[PDB]
């Protein structure tokens, strides 16, 4: 720091000395300007008008230049002077973003203070190449059960969350965010803390405020940031927000830390790109989209990566979100993102209303990484679980017709129903990995087959309270060793036996 009179005034006095290109707007319409001049413009650079509004130059035609505006076009008047700053569009990075809400360009909208960050980063960047990478070996604890068991997620992955409207997409992401506060509070190792970024494209400010409220109510903002490019926000801001999020996440990825980024309504980005190109008179493709949509999403998703031990060892996981219409995944955007993602998490309304919540279809849903992003203790249970659920899914359709079956098949149906009733969860109620392991142990070793299906929802909670009270040591041992030795196996079985003795259910 420094003192005002003797230093700052001298500095400004030394600063004031100075003396001795520009263009003019030619056409204006629909949040877009066409200028004449500025022959020394970089394609993609920031531009400043004579009223404070900003813009981005995209079409460097021969006669004119095509700029997209970050706001309303009432300020531009077909003749206003325009000046280029020379900066490519960039955003601040650092821990000053944690706990804050910002627009597509890093300008805060929380209403509490400016952004204390000194280092910036370019929005559109080259992804990291083949050599500075490694395989995915660490898990990303989502807090859910069916995800963490059957569709695991690693640190460095790019897993899609695809479904219909009102199916639990944001809720899945919010539980993924909420599960991390324990992991972060119970350490000071930044290599182990998981920071989070939530980009919201097309959402309404009421929804974003509800999300911020749900996170503040659970202390889940000191390790997150939010990037709100809502519907009133212009098309270029909606189109730029996810690249800004990836720029904010590359600081973690490169600085040895970890991160997760959730693009919410990733189809509104493509809508905005269509809008921009069609108002820039670019010709469309199919569904009126351009052909550069693949190169629009590939640039973005290839920034998620797991770096090597020479580049710090960081990671940036990605969890894009997509809304389909009538379950049509034969469309263009779903097809592109499935062809450029490391997995899928499908969500259905039939399963959402049948009683399965989260309504994850574990057949279509996959994760190419798979067990490598899974703990051994969870592998042991989840292999059997996947096998049993495959069998149940095969057999239940024929079983429902009232036929009479043997015991080897009745056991399949019973175990499948038990697991299907176990994997249900309330919203904003995530669980630790050790507790998931214990619950799925109870479900897999047959301590729920005779029990009634409707009673499992309270079996689960009572067992959770029981093991949290009297058998925390088993949980700590599983959390540390990350496996199930015979000792922990026996201790857990004994705890379950004590619980079933102490308690009584309808069967």
């Amino acid at each position: 720091a420094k003192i005002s009179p003797s230093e700052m005034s001298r500095l400004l006095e030394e600063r004031i000395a100075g003396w001795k290109e520009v263009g003019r707007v030619v056409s204006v319409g629909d949040g877009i300007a066409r200028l004449f001049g500025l022959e020394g413009v970089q394609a993609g650079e920031l531009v400043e008008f004579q009223n404070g509004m900003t813009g981005m130059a995209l079409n460097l035609e021969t006669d004119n230049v095509g700029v997209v505006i970050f706001g309303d076009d009432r300020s531009v008047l077909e003749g206003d002077s325009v000046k280029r700053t020379g900066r490519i569009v960039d955003v601040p990075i650092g821990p000053g973003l944690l706990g804050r809400v910002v627009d597509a360009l890093g300008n805060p909208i929380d209403g509490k203070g400016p952004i204390p960050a000194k280092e910036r980063r370019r929005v559109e960047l080259k992804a990291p190449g083949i050599i500075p990478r490694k395989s995915v070996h660490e898990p990303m604890m989502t807090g859910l059960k069916c995800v963490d068991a059957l569709v695991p997620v690693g640190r460095g992955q790019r897993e899609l969350i695809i479904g219909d409207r009102q199916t639990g997409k944001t809720a899945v992401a919010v539980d993924a965010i909420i599960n991390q506060k324990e992991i972060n509070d119970s350490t000071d190792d930044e290599s182990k803390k998981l920071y989070c970024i939530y980009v919201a494209v097309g959402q309404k400010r009421s929804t974003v405020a509800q999300i911020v409220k749900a996170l503040e109510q659970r202390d889940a903002m000191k390790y997150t940031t939010v990037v709100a490019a809502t519907a009133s926000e212009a098309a270029p801001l909606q189109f730029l927000a996810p690249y800004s999020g990836c720029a904010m996440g590359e600081w973690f990825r490169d600085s040895g830390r970890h991160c997760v980024i959730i693009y919410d309504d990733l189809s509104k980005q493509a809508t905005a790109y269509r809008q921009m190109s069609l108002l820039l008179r670019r010709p469309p493709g199919r569904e009126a989209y351009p052909g550069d949509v693949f190169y629009l999403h590939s640039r973005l998703l290839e920034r998620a990566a797991k770096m090597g031990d020479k580049s710090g060892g960081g990671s940036l996981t990605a969890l894009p979100v997509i809304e389909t219409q009538a379950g049509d995944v034969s469309a263009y955007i779903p097809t592109n993102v499935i062809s450029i993602t490391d997995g899928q998490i499908f969500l259905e309304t039939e399963l959402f209303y049948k009683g399965i919540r989260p309504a994850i279809n574990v057949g279509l849903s996959v994760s190419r990484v798979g067990s490598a992003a899974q703990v051994k203790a969870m592998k042991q249970v989840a292999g059997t679980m996947k096998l049993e659920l495959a069998q149940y899914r095969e057999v239940a359709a024929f079983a429902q017709f009232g036929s009479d079956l043997d015991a080897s098949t009745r056991q399949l149906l019973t175990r499948g129903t038990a697991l299907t009733e176990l994997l249900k969860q309330r919203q904003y109620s995530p669980m630790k990995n050790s507790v998931q392991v214990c619950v799925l142990y109870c479900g897999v070793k047959g301590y729920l087959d005779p029990l009634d299906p409707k009673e499992i929802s309270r079996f689960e909670s009572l067992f959770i309270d029981y093991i949290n009270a009297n058998h925390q040591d088993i949980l700590k041992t599983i959390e540390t060793e990350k496996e199930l030795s015979e000792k922990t196996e026996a201790k857990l079985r004994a705890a379950v036996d004590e619980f079933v003795a102490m308690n009584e259910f309808k069967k």
């Binding site: 720091a1 005002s4 700052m8 003396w19 001795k20």
Partner: protein, 52 residues
């Protein structure tokens, strides 16, 4: 103690910020008054532009 020092540093920063802010506002207002008041500054600025 660390949180105390972070708070006091931030307070000092905002102090110096507001200080230079008002120092500029007031210098600007003083010049906007003196220019419109005095006749000499007009021809002085004329000569300044000419020689510039």
């Amino acid at each position: 103690l660390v949180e105390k020092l972070n708070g006091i540093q931030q307070a000092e920063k905002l102090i110096q910020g507001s200080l230079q802010d008002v120092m500029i506002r007031e210098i600007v207002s003083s010049f906007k008054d003196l220019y419109k008041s005095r006749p000499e500054l007009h021809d002085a600025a004329m000569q300044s532009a000419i020689q510039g």
